Design an enzyme around this catalytic site. Sequence first.
Site, PDB file in Angstrom:
ATOM      1  CD  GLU A   1      -2.641  -1.576   0.100  1.00 32.76           C
ATOM      2  OE1 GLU A   1      -3.044  -0.639  -0.610  1.00 32.76           O
ATOM      3  OE2 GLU A   1      -2.899  -2.765  -0.160  1.00 32.76           O
TER       4      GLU A   1
ATOM      5  CG  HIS B   1     -13.123  -9.998 -12.007  1.00 28.63           C
ATOM      6  ND1 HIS B   1     -12.926 -10.828 -10.927  1.00 28.63           N
ATOM      7  CD2 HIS B   1     -12.290  -8.947 -11.832  1.00 28.63           C
ATOM      8  CE1 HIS B   1     -12.018 -10.298 -10.129  1.00 28.63           C
ATOM      9  NE2 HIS B   1     -11.616  -9.157 -10.656  1.00 28.63           N
TER      10      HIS B   1
HETATM   11 ZN   LIG Z   1      -2.590  -2.904  -4.835  1.00 30.99          ZN
END
Ligand SMILES: [Zn+2]
EC number: 3.4.17.23
Lengths: 586, 144
Positions: A348, A478
Amino acid sequence: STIEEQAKTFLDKFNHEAEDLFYQSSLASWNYNTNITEENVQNMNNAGDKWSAFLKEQSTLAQMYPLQEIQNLTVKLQLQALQQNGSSVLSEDKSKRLNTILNTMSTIYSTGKVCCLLLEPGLNEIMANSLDYNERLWAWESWRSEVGKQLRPLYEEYVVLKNEMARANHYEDYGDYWRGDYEVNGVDGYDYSRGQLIEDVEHTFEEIKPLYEHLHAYVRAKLMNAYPSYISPIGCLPAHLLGDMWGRFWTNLYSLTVPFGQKPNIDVTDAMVDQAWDAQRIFKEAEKFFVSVGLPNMTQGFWENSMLTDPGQKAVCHPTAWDLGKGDFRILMCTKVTMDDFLTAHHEMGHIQYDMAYAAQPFLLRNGANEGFHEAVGEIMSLSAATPKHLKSIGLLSPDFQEDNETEINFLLKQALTIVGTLPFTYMLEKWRWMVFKGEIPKDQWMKKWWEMKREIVGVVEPVPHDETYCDPASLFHVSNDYSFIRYYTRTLYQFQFQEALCQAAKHEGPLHKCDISNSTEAGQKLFNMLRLGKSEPWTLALENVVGAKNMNVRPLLNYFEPLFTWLKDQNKNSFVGWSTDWSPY
Amino acid sequence: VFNATRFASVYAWNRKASFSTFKCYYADSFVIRGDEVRQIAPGQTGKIADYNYKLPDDFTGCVIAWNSNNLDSKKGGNYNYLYRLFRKSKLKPFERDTSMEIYQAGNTPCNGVKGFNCYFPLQSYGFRPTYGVGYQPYRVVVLS
Ligand SMILES: [Zn+2]
Ligand SMILES: *[C@@H]1O[C@H](CO)[C@@H](O)[C@H](O)[C@H]1NC(C)=O
Ligand SMILES: *[C@@H]1O[C@H](CO)[C@@H](O)[C@H](O)[C@H]1NC(C)=O
Ligand SMILES: *[C@@H]1O[C@H](CO)[C@@H](O)[C@H](O)[C@H]1NC(C)=O
């Protein structure tokens, strides 16, 4: 006054208004996510509606500047970004019909139950943990026969509406629309079309095929040990036995297929919960790592306004990196004392460093070079931070540790199960979707071709026959939530191109799987020269700045997994390598 | 005036410790953004040194600037501070323009109303306490 000057003036007005509207929208969304109440679901919708209306109006009045009268290529990029129509080209009835279809397809997926288990965590724990053929087969066929059978006709109408929406926008179908993210025009030497991505993907898979053959044969022998009377030594692998509902990753197979089972993998959870680490020490270590290679610190607002621990009020603890605009970067993550949160922090913060890099580009040029750059830049940091040399240099592993040639094979095999075992799946799914959008697979053959490209490209067979009332592909998140799927292939290649280039700039001698770019500034000037560009340059030029070539390549991916390939070649000496598309379990 | 309770706007600048910037080379007072303080100097270029506040190339006074985030910003937004975005030509040293006329950017004129290619020339900083250090208010005073 030429129509270019008027475009520049229109754009420098647009930027100044959009920055403010977008900031307040995203602040509303964050305030909702970190504290779920009833007053906040409305304050989110208010600002969301305001921002969407602004964008619609600005696009409508931007369409009045014709691109042929503009010689500057940055003004052209931003005006193209703004002049896009979307479902605005359809009627009103057709727009409302498409939205109703999309919402029905999403809610059929997210609340489906079989008999009384839901997909999460009901049927996922039977697929990741069970060791029974009959129970796994029951869960598999139940999820296939309850949800997808309801999503078939909605998907059939989805295809028609999306194809005509894309054809009215001067494309040829919806797959072409999707591939339009990798297109470059007007640059001399760095051009790329929408029909060349297919060629590149199919040219790289032909070289990935042998390592997948050897891994498939090894896994087949081990599963033949574990499910004795159910597997054939020359056929495909039954679909419900891969530790996953669809087979996207082969990770949960590790326990059955570990090379040297009397050697445990590295896990420093105890070595950190025993030294009294907490949630802030992890992020201080990640900040130290990123500063070591010459990138900047974090901001004071990051430490004051980030949620880095579960505050007992509700919350959504999914790890996220937030770029609100106007100097405001944040992270939302309820972290623990573990060895996987230690790595998620590095992922992150790599996202956040990439965001901070291109914060000087105009509002519409602030992204990656294409749709597969953020994730690769995030993943190489977790690659380089999990190295026993790194874990020994931060005091989290004893200096009496000695790497073993039998312990570097367990690691490489786990990495293979996760990373290589997913590429035929991705390639085959996006190929099927492209061919269905193009019109090369009629309706009455959809399911006939799905289960023909699974036995050929992936090597996987179905336990029970499926006729044409089924929509197996749409049983994935998806496919029924209207997302593309080729960014994972290209991202998985880019990450190893990046890591080889950076560990070659850091003067690393030895195997590529042991390299650590810490304390290297020459490896941090090559990354920043690509991070600072946003999307103001063709992705081929930004790829060439770091690497040296201007296209995809599969050779560093195969250099990472070379010792494992040699070991597997020796292990499969008396086996059959390759499958036959005729054996079926029924 | 270094201690008044309310400062002007940069396009309508006035004329009569913790100093983040004290660069020496009447007392003008205004409020600008964080990363625009660099433009208050001889030979600079931007929006502030073009359309709002210009300094000559041969200057003698000083420049003082300091943060103001705890006074000039509020939860929700402080839309009382403005700056000029569009102008027909650059300013002159120490000139001042308080006009509020519609700016015509094309070939057909404005009827004194906004619309296609006619823009209102003033724009506000909406100041908030959760902004980056470059987007936070700054109080500036220029001597001589
Ligand atoms: Zn990521
Ligand atoms: C959470 O939200 C409620 C109302 O939505 C508010 O009263 C409360 O102060 C919030 N929590 C925090 C820590 O601000
Ligand atoms: C294009 O316009 C930008 C300003 O929007 C300018 O900085 C740049 O030099 C221009 N490029 C060319 C080739 O004129
Ligand atoms: C980086 O350099 C510092 C300073 O010499 C050292 O303490 C640290 O162990 C090094 N880290 C790595 C991963 O080499």
